Amino acid sequence: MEVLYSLSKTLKDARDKIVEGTLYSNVSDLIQQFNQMIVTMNGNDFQTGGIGNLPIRNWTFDFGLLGTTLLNLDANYVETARTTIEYFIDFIDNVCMDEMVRESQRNGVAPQSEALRKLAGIKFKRINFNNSSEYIENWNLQNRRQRTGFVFHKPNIFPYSASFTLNRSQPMHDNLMGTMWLNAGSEIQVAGFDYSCALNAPANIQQFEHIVQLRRALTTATITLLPDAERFSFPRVINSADGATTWFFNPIILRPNNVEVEFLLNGQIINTYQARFGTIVARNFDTIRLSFQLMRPPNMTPAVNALFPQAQPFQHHATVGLTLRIESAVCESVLADANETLLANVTAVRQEYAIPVGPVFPPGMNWTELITNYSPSREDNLQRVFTVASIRSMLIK
Amino acid sequence: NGQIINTYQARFGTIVARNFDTIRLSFQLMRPPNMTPAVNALFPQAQPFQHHATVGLTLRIESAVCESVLADANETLLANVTAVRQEYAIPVGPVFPPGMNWTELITNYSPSREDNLQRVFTVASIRSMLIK
Amino acid sequence: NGQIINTYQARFGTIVARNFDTIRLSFQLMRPPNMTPAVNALFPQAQPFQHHATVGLTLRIESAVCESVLADANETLLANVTAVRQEYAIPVGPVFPPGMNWTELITNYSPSREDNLQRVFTVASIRSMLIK
Amino acid sequence: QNYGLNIPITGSMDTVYSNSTREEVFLTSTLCLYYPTEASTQISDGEWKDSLSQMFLIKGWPTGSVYFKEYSNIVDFSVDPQLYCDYNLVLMKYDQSLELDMSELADLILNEWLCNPMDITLYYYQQSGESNKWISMGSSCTVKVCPLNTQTLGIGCQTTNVDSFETVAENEKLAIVDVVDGINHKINLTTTTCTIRNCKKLGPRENVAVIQVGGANILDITADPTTNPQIERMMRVNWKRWWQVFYTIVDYINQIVQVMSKRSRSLNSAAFYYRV
Amino acid sequence: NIPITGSMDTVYSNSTREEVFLTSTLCLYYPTEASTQISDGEWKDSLSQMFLIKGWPTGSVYFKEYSNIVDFSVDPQLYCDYNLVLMKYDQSLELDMSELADLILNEWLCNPMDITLYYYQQSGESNKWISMGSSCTVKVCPLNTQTLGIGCQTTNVDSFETVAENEKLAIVDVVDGINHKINLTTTTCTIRNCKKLGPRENVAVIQVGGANILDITADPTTNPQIERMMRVNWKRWWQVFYTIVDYINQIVQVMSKRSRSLNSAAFYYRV
Amino acid sequence: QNYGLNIPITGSMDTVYSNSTREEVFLTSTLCLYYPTEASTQISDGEWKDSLSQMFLIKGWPTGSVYFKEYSNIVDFSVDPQLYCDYNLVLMKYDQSLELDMSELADLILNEWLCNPMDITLYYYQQSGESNKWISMGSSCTVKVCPLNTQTLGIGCQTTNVDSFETVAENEKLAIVDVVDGINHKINLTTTTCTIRNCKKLGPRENVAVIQVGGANILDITADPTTNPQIERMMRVNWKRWWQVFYTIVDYINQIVQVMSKRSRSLNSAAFYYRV
Numbered sequence A: 001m002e003v004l005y006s007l008s009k010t011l012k013d014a015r016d017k018i019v020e021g022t023l024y025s026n027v028s029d030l031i032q033q034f035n036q037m038i039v040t041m042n043g044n045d046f047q048t049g050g051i052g053n054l055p056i057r058n059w060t061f062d063f064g065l066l067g068t069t070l071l072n073l074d075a076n077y078v079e080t081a082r083t084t085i086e087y088f089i090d091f092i093d094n095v096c097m098d099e100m101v102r103e104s105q106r107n108g109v110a111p112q113s114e115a116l117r118k119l120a121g122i123k124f125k126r127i128n129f130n131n132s133s134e135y136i137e138n139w140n141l142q143n144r145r146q147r148t149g150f151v152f153h154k155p156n157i158f159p160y161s162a163s164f165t166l167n168r169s170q171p172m173h174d175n176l177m178g179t180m181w182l183n184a185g186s187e188i189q190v191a192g193f194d195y196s197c198a199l200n201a202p203a204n205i206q207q208f209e210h211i212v213q214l215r216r217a218l219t220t221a222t223i224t225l226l227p228d229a230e231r232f233s234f235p236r237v238i239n240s241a242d243g244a245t246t247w248f249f250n251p252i253i254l255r256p257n258n259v260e261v262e263f264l265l266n267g268q269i270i271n272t273y274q275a276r277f278g279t280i281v282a283r284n285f286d287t288i289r290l291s292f293q294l295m296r297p298p299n300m301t302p303a304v305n306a307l308f309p310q311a312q313p314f315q316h317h318a319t320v321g322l323t324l325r326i327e328s329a330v331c332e333s334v335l336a337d338a339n340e341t342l343l344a345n346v347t348a349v350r351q352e353y354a355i356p357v358g359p360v361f362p363p364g365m366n367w368t369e370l371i372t373n374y375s376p377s378r379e380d381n382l383q384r385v386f387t388v389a390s391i392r393s394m395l396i397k
Numbered sequence B, C: 001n002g003q004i005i006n007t008y009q010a011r012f013g014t015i016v017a018r019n020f021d022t023i024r025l026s027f028q029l030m031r032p033p034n035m036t037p038a039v040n041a042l043f044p045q046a047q048p049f050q051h052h053a054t055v056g057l058t059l060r061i062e063s064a065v066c067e068s069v070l071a072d073a074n075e076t077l078l079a080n081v082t083a084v085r086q087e088y089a090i091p092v093g094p095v096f097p098p099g100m101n102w103t104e105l106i107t108n109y110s111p112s113r114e115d116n117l118q119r120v121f122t123v124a125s126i127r128s129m130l131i132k
Numbered sequence D, F: 001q002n003y004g005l006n007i008p009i010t011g012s013m014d015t016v017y018s019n020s021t022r023e024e025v026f027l028t029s030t031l032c033l034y035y036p037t038e039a040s041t042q043i044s045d046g047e048w049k050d051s052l053s054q055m056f057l058i059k060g061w062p063t064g065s066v067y068f069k070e071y072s073n074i075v076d077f078s079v080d081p082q083l084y085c086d087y088n089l090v091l092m093k094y095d096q097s098l099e100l101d102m103s104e105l106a107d108l109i110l111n112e113w114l115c116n117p118m119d120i121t122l123y124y125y126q127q128s129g130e131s132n133k134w135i136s137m138g139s140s141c142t143v144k145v146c147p148l149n150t151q152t153l154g155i156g157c158q159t160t161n162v163d164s165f166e167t168v169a170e171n172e173k174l175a176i177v178d179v180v181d182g183i184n185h186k187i188n189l190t191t192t193t194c195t196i197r198n199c200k201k202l203g204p205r206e207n208v209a210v211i212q213v214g215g216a217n218i219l220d221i222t223a224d225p226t227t228n229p230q231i232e233r234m235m236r237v238n239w240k241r242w243w244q245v246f247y248t249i250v251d252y253i254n255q256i257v258q259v260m261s262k263r264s265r266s267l268n269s270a271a272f273y274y275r276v
Numbered sequence E: 001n002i003p004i005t006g007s008m009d010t011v012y013s014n015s016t017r018e019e020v021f022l023t024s025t026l027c028l029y030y031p032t033e034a035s036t037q038i039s040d041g042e043w044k045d046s047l048s049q050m051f052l053i054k055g056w057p058t059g060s061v062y063f064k065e066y067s068n069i070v071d072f073s074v075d076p077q078l079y080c081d082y083n084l085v086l087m088k089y090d091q092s093l094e095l096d097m098s099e100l101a102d103l104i105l106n107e108w109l110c111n112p113m114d115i116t117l118y119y120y121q122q123s124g125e126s127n128k129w130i131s132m133g134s135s136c137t138v139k140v141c142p143l144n145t146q147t148l149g150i151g152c153q154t155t156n157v158d159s160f161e162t163v164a165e166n167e168k169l170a171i172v173d174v175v176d177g178i179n180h181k182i183n184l185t186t187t188t189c190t191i192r193n194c195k196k197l198g199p200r201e202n203v204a205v206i207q208v209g210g211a212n213i214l215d216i217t218a219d220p221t222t223n224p225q226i227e228r229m230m231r232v233n234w235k236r237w238w239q240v241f242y243t244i245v246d247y248i249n250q251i252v253q254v255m256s257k258r259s260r261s262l263n264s265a266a267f268y269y270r271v
């Protein structure tokens, strides 16, 4: 795989630095690397594809070395370089597609795709150029562990889950109390609602608590915590827990008082913040406990007093919510983001050629299921296909 | 090109599109067959209709790959070009809209406009290499 | 990961699971349609119910293969580690539970605990090669 | 043990569920009309219960479900109102000077109550809170109270001379008296003809519904002055002919039971739980 | 109905009040006792001059006196473009006042009924039978599948179940889905089978007397207080009319232009 | 609080079970003894209620928490026997020929009957299943049932001739009448004097215990003839002296209350199922 990356990097460098009029001093080392690649790949046969609709293709290499007796590149040089580079780029693109489409329940790190399996031999170590990109560097470190980390912007670590729990309820759903929430992408929006405005709660304070269990620990995350979950601040009708009947929900937004937010790793509290909003940080956290409260206002204007009565009718229902965006984070394992098209590339490759559902990944690369159940074999396969997708993106966009 | 390339049915969260020129969001509003008395009083069979049922969909395009050049939330190319034009009060040209407002520039995004946009954006990249 | 890897219906005796993470045991209590007078007396229509119907299953994992290290009925590594801790009264540390209570150790099996467990088990086997 | 009160029920907001907890210990739901005797008087018929049962059979209720029950007048029905039955509708013929008695019967039946006795002649009683009332029912109740000081000396009334007591309800079949919460009280009424009970108010009995047959909207079940809620079950109609009223109820019966909900129903027929 | 797309940024248009006051007509239906108490007869001209201040041209206002509510109920023609109905409330007239309010406020599609030949059902919630006349006493005898009375004998009109007596206007709702035989005094009263469409935007009812009692929706459950059922207290009809004139802008703002492809021709007082 | 929902509840097995509750139930609840008048007649006293109260106080209960009720005899007691009282005992003196009446009362006050009214003059009534009976109460009940064909023509009787009907109760104060579950019936019963309710039997009423003071095992609470179960709360004590009977109950009051249990339908946890 390091060899595949080296192929892609040297072809990218050839397309970039071998340009008309450039000094040979600017591309001497690159030309030497290109000639090593040519001499190593020459006199070989590779076979690519043959799964789903990915058509079978045969690659044979017999090319002349780029010259070296030129002080300053001219137009004729670049024509020969182009004729070689386009074929090589097509070959690397097809190898990457073949590698991405495949899977393996066991030893998912080891390369599938007999083309790449051949490239992992002993004759092709001489192509190894350098491993600068974040994905390939972390690939090397993981293959021989030093501590690693991918920095992600707004990582979709939560599986999509919108739901609710009712700590107090009735069959006719007039006097409810509990929480609603939506975890999606990098958003946790949790709204605790009480239909009685904590009329009879101890000290007129109702307690809400939401536990989120990340599937992988995040590191040095930046978190924007604000009050007033928006999605649960307008009237709705909600199918019940059983689904038999629907119940109305008519929010009136109070603020959450003495909100505490705890970032835990392996059960111990790593970070804790109390009534701090805006941007905060979490050192290393695996679960989030958002605890907040609904205090009935001691003093009340005529209007709010008319809103919150002491009897059962309860036309309007008090709610307090939090919104929590993980703006950025650092994860040892790989994840989709909002800034990287790796997952999009892999899924598009599979969809284009209609690969049958394999043993490990879920159908359609459904990221919600994939993050919901994220076993280590699935993680290894995801890392392999993602790094190969990065290697492809270095040339094909 | 009017060819159904991807179709996601009752799947929320993150989704992907290989290549798409049009998005068709289809959804439905089903009257709740069973109804707590609160919602029943909320929706009457009579005429008044004092509360109006709605059903929504939000769709962010988190990231994409485009053959042509566009503005972003991550790139200061459009801002650089527009600022350079404004600082020196360039007269309105024959191709770009007055003030280079992105809304009217992408409402009509003809190929000549795209060509000039790519040129000025690439020059802005070259400048921003040095003068940030 | 939520996908049936194997499913066995009314096949008792020795069975094989290729690779699994969860076990779903479904069974049913079917009232005997035909009843001898004795059993019919056992199961009445009214409320008393002096006898209560029950149906059970027993599932033994005789042997298996695992990536993460575990304790067994065959390997003395867990016993060796816990014993050498108790011998010198090592104070309760961060990751392992107090006294190396295996139930508490496995009920939550965080990767930190797993890594430390593999290390200490490897050292335990290395010691067991010589000291018994 | 319980019915799983102390643990939460979870549900998804983006999924429509299928399987239901089918449970039924019944013949079927039973609609149940209470109508004043003047209705049958004006109707002047007597195959009319048969006629209405045939109508309800078209509307979807089997024969043996619907029941019709006559009461003389609302004030006399108030004394110990029994709802022996599943889906209760009560037709209250509004007329002037019965506003309080109607509103009070509505307050009694529409709401669930938890009542303890009151050995009136021995102790002195208070009212714990906003939800606590004294409900007195009988042939002729006449409640005369007397508040007491902290020293157990009457204020505005000598505790011995009953003539000085403050009368709060005079010769009524049903009187739901609220007095000041936190004052000991000595109570006097006609122990043979009336029974007084110390009743807390639980949630609302979401089973019985009240159709006001006559005019303006006056039903204020909530004894509080500030709040005057208009519940879904405080239905009303404009009437001239009882036949038209009954046809209206029959035609729109499905909507009425959609407003109601039969899940709240007690074993006994009493309008209030009794907890000695 | 074709779709009509519209932006959410277009600027609000100028006030159309003057345009509608120049282009439309207002008409007031009041009881005869109003004029009797006013004890005048230059008062129509005075009120027209008064309306001219608020901006209704001289011919735009039409005063159509009616004898009383029950007598006006019988087939009310609303010859106008914006209709106001002053409606004096008296005890025991609650249902008839409500009947008139329902009739005029709601749009009805009415079909003739031939009582002497056919037995009529009611299609559903929106269907009623409206009987109008000098004295309507509709008696109903429900029928079986074999056309035999239940609670009644189909040939003995005495055993029938009376649902209205001597009323100028009766809006009867019977149990839907059952055939009925009707006895109504065919020489006097006319009965029509009507379906309630949407509301009539053209008309507003100013209840003049007592409490909020009008119930347009025959459903017991819903009792919606529609915006066009205005109410005001009174002691002097002069004060009532001055109130209406002063607040005419609000009333016609509450009302709106009628929209229905009618089929029955009738006289209108348009400009 | 998720009233009206059957939510599964998990429970360990290594939990160390908690301490006693007898002190709680004694200091909170209310013991409640129903005895026949002949008991007091043989006692020939009238401080004896106070004496028993003091002895109960020695045995644990508070002073004002044990209550005594009298009844003329079992057959008269059977007419709407309501036990509004937190821990009910019924001393029941046995005699020949009252076996069925004792069984009727025992069934009625030991099992929770939920039930709807019956309009005898109008409807034909069909028994749904095993657990459905009709209970008739009054000063004199003489039920006459005529079964009906599928064409609604009586068999062994004529719909229009009450004489041919098949009587299944004569002047009984209480009658739990059963009929062939699945056939329509036309009933005649003396509507002015005796009322009849279509009732079906839920689980057992655990708040009531019946102490047969006399003879052998005869209470068949189960209408089915095949099963004759011996419930815990059907106690039996030999008697020759009412003082000795009351002393036995007082001494063993702990065990009797242990046999009994708090009324499920009175707990808050049963709020939206059938709470009473």
Ligand SMILES: *[C@@H]1O[C@H](CO)[C@@H](O[C@@H]2O[C@H](CO)[C@@H](O[C@@H]3O[C@H](CO)[C@@H](O)[C@H](O)[C@@H]3O)[C@H](O)[C@H]2NC(C)=O)[C@H](O)[C@H]1NC(C)=O
Pocket (backbone or CB within 6 Å): E115, E116, E157, E182, E183, E184, E185, E186
């Ligand atoms: C609904 O019921 C009324 C109540 O009876 C019906 O009125 C009846 O109308 C007929 C025809 O107009 C009357 O017939 C008259 O009979 C006498 C002798 O019996 C004869 O002298 C007349 O020339 C005429 O034929 C009948 O008297 C009258 N009933 C009463 C009590 O006055 C009404 O016709 C019924 N509705 C319909 C649509 O039929």
Ligand SMILES: *[C@@H]1O[C@H](CO)[C@@H](O)[C@H](O)[C@H]1NC(C)=O
Pocket (backbone or CB within 6 Å): A241, A242, D016, D017, D018, D019, D020
């Ligand atoms: C069936 O009902 C249960 C509630 O007891 C619920 O958890 C489950 O999701 C329902 N079935 C489906 C397919 O949703």
Ligand SMILES: *[C@@H]1O[C@H](CO)[C@@H](O)[C@H](O)[C@H]1NC(C)=O
Pocket (backbone or CB within 6 Å): D120, D121, D162, D163, D188, D189, D190, D191
């Ligand atoms: C009520 O007052 C009268 C008049 O003094 C008295 O005779 C009667 O005993 C009182 N009621 C009670 C329950 O004491």
Ligand SMILES: *[C@@H]1O[C@H](CO)[C@@H](O)[C@H](O)[C@H]1NC(C)=O
Pocket (backbone or CB within 6 Å): E014
């Ligand atoms: C609308 O109102 C504005 C402000 O009064 C005025 O300038 C404008 O002329 C009006 N529009 C027309 C068409 O007169």
Ligand SMILES: *[C@@H]1O[C@H](CO)[C@@H](O)[C@H](O)[C@H]1NC(C)=O
Pocket (backbone or CB within 6 Å): F018, F019
């Ligand atoms: C139960 O009783 C024992 C001794 O009688 C006592 O040690 C223990 O604390 C009690 N349990 C509780 C929960 O108090």
Ligand SMILES: *[C@@H]1O[C@H](CO)[C@@H](O)[C@H](O)[C@H]1NC(C)=O
Pocket (backbone or CB within 6 Å): F120, F121, F162, F163, F187, F188, F189, F190, F191
């Ligand atoms: C029962 O039959 C008698 C005649 O023997 C009759 O007087 C009585 O009214 C009947 N009761 C009922 C409820 O039909």
Ligand SMILES: [Ca+2]
Pocket (backbone or CB within 6 Å): D100, D101, D104, D172, D173, D174, D175, D176
């Ligand atoms: Ca009263």
Ligand SMILES: [Ca+2]
Pocket (backbone or CB within 6 Å): D156, D157, D164, D165, D166
């Ligand atoms: Ca006084």
Ligand SMILES: [Ca+2]
Pocket (backbone or CB within 6 Å): D127, D129, D130, D132, D133, D178, D179, D180, D181
């Ligand atoms: Ca009070």
Ligand SMILES: [Ca+2]
Pocket (backbone or CB within 6 Å): D220, D221, D222, D223, D224, D225, D226, D227, D228, D229
């Ligand atoms: Ca009030």
Ligand SMILES: [Ca+2]
Pocket (backbone or CB within 6 Å): D045, D046, E151, E152, E159, E160, E161
């Ligand atoms: Ca009749």
Ligand SMILES: [Ca+2]
Pocket (backbone or CB within 6 Å): E095, E096, E099, E167, E168, E169, E170, E171
């Ligand atoms: Ca009328």
Ligand SMILES: [Ca+2]
Pocket (backbone or CB within 6 Å): D251, E122, E124, E125, E127, E128, E173, E174, E175, E176
């Ligand atoms: Ca109708």
Ligand SMILES: [Ca+2]
Pocket (backbone or CB within 6 Å): D236, E215, E216, E217, E218, E219, E220, E221, E222, E223, E224
């Ligand atoms: Ca209405």
Ligand SMILES: [Ca+2]
Pocket (backbone or CB within 6 Å): F156, F157, F164, F165, F166
């Ligand atoms: Ca016979």
Ligand SMILES: [Ca+2]
Pocket (backbone or CB within 6 Å): F078, F100, F101, F104, F172, F173, F174, F175
């Ligand atoms: Ca008996």
